[PDB]
Amino acid sequence: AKLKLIKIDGSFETEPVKLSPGLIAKELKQQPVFDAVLVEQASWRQGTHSIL
RNA sequence: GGAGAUGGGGAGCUGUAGCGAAAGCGAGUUUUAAAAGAGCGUUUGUUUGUUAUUAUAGACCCGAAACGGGUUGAGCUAGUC
Numbered sequence: 001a002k003l004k005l006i007k008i009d010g011s012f013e014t015e016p017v018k019l020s021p022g023l024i025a026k027e028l029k030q031q032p033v034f035d036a037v038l039v040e041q042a043s044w045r046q047g048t049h050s051i052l
Numbered sequence: 053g054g055a056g057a058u059g060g061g062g063a064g065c066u067g068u069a070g071c072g073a074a075a076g077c078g079a080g081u082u083u084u085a086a087a088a089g090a091g092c093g094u095u096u097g098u099u100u101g102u103u104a105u106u107a108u109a110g111a112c113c114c115g116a117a118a119c120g121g122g123u124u125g126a127g128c129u130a131g132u133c
Binding site for chain 1: 055056057058100101
């Protein structure tokens, strides 16, 4: 695509960088995204609770 | 490795050829003298998520009389001294 470089001033550069098309997929998966976000929101749990 | 997602890690797991008690044979095979007949086979996978049911753990909850083991008690009462 037209990915373009930025300087520290905040003003862009004048020479954008093209991208290999293998990065951008024509087919999107929207169930594995959701599964991944849940599996990462879990695994962040200590689970130290206890009761007699 | 941020008490991380994940990366490495193919050792194993299931499926890919069944049949037979077994050696064995092999899209055939066991029984059988039989290459007939019949039985069984002649491809539809796997790993996770979630839910229902189920197994071993008290396993919906409450409820015994009891069983066993260790200790404490003869300052009432029974006996003896």
